[PDB]
């Protein structure tokens, strides 16, 4: 019958559908939207992660696509060529959203980091500014707030070295911060 034209047709079907869900979440992927909150920041990932769960959901549709075009070859469709062309194209459309997905993650991730980096500043800034208006348990909460200022300066060095995308903003807050202390630190 029309047997062969009509398994042509199944196919190209089920690839244009897979495009364009792969369409779909590609656009969702390419968000440039990041979090100016600590909270936010993880809901944001919250939601990547959701997005991860729903791309692999459709891993079996994937294979059954594969298997489908592996019977047509396999039995040599006349259209094989156009087949074999069509499989190539959405390994590699599978292979860019992965890529999409994994370059949105790590922005989300150095969202993350900046934001606790930032809330951290705040902790060290909200407490300097507190002791420069009145300006033995004061010796105690000195080596305290110390030991807070130094993870602050280890951890922003860390995303400097790791090629933050704020590597201009985390120096700069940091370094301010180191300089605004060793000021608080002269005159306590």
Known sequence: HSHDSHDLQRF???????????????????????????????????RHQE?????DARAGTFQAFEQFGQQLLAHGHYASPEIKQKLDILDQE????????????????????????????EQAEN??????????????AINVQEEKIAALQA???????????????????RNEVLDRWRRLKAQM
């Not at 993650?105 to 951290?120: G, S, Y």
């Not at 407490?127 to 105690?140: C, P, S, T, V």
């Open 12 to 46: 190209l079907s089920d690839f244009r559908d897979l495009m364009s869900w792969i369409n779909g979440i590609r656009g969702l992927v390419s968000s440039d939207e990041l979090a100016k909150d600590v909270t936010g920041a993880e809901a944001l990932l919250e």
């Open 51 to 55: 997005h991860r769960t729903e791309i």
């Open 94 to 121: 599978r292979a860019d959203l992965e890529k999409a997905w994994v370059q949105r993650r790590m922005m989300l991730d150095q969202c993350l980091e900046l934001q606790l980096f930032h809330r951290d500043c």
């Open 127 to 140: 407490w300097m500014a507190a002791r420069e208006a009145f300006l033995e348990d004061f010796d105690k």
């Open 155 to 173: 951890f922003a060095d860390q995303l400097i070295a790791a090629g933050h995308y704020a590597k201009g903003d985390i120096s700069s807050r």
